[PDB]
Amino acid sequence: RITEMVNDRRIMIQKLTLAEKPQVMRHVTTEINNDLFFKMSPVAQLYIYH
Amino acid sequence: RITEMVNDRRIMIQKLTLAEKPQVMRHVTTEINNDLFFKMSPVAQLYIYH
Amino acid sequence: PTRYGTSESIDKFKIAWENVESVLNMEGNDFVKTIMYAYEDNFPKKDFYMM
Amino acid sequence: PTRYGTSESIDKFKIAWENVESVLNMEGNDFVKTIMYAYEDNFPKKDFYMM
Amino acid sequence: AIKMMQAAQLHRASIEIAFPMNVSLSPEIIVQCFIVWMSIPEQLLSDRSNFIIAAVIWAGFSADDSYADIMRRSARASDRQNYDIIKAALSSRKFKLPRAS
Amino acid sequence: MASTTRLVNDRKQLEQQVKDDARILADARGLNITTVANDSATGGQAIRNVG
Amino acid sequence: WTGTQNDLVNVSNHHMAYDEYKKRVAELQRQGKISIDVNDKHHIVRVFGDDSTFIMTYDEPPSAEEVHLMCATFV
Amino acid sequence: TIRKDDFRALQAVLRIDEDRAADMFTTLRIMISSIPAVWYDAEVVHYPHT
Predict the structure, then answer these.
(1) What does the CA dihedral B15, B18, B20, B24 come to, rounded to 10 degrees?
(2) What residue in A sits closest to H50 (Cα-Cα)?
């Protein structure tokens, strides 16, 4: 998911060892995409200026 | 046995004695195949690097 | 492989290797043994035991 | 002519260069020697020796 | 030295270059890329690293394309193919670079 | 153009021969491999998912 | 030319000291001490005659004992 | 920006001397003839080694 996130080839992500592939982590409930950012338009000007 | 090998160098040994021939002495020689370490292993990269 | 767990078997194998090394041969370095020991955390336990 | 002409290992060049280096330090050849040791990177020893 | 010696033996352990973080086209990056281009043999590097080096080199010579416009060529072609295109562009009648092999 | 014009090549061949026979007879004493450990960690900044 | 000579000599051995301090720091990093991710980016050396100073910048600031370890290694 | 003349100097300073080449070749010649060749096919593991 992170690799698909960062489309730039200059960035390269650490490779995973065989023993580290099946390890388990906790992810967030819902991801932050452009959808959420589009909904802050009425107040975006203040944030940009500051 | 020593004189027989003609591999790379000229080995010369003086005649011992008419009476010192039957003297006994211990000399061991390992007899184990060494071709079973050079198989294709999933860890060969570590061998090469080290 | 059907007597212990996936880790107790590894420990038993290590003990057997150390015992055999100290029984027959004089003390040395055992290049392959140290190579196996150092990178044992880069492999899952099952395939490490198989290897 | 024969016996290690234009096709020899770069190892052998050290042997050949010794005589030229010795001659280039004979108290009266100093003009060429300084020019050689100042502009080596543009005119390396190999082409000078070939010339 | 050890890594370069290993990369010349295994046929599959080619060196992978890690570029500096969150700094693009800094003055030292350009000269370091040039040194890599004309001093490090091409067969000892990964296709990705060769492509990045070639992109940094070609950014400053192209009449129109910029660095981002060149890095955007990741799609529509592979890494090795892009590297070959750029290298062929750098050996034309107008530009000539060594590219040590 | 005589036998005096074959001295440099003679020295080259003699040097190669001496280098060879100085190593054919030299004893083979293998060393003990040491200093083998896992010391190739890789750093960098984490991802640190926001939410 | 006393000041010029002093500042030329002072700025010379500083580079040779930093060169080997980098090796020692890399040695400590592979073992467990200073830890990875503590790598400087810009180092500036300023010389005024005999007296001189050395400033190194970091992206993540090392903790207090890291500073002591690296300063001891450099000295 | 860099002047077109700044490259030929860079190529000139990167040249390799003859004695340097001989020393380069000696070590490689003694290394190619001793390392086992059955491990050259090994797939890379522990990526930080490259």
Answers:
(1) 90
(2) A15
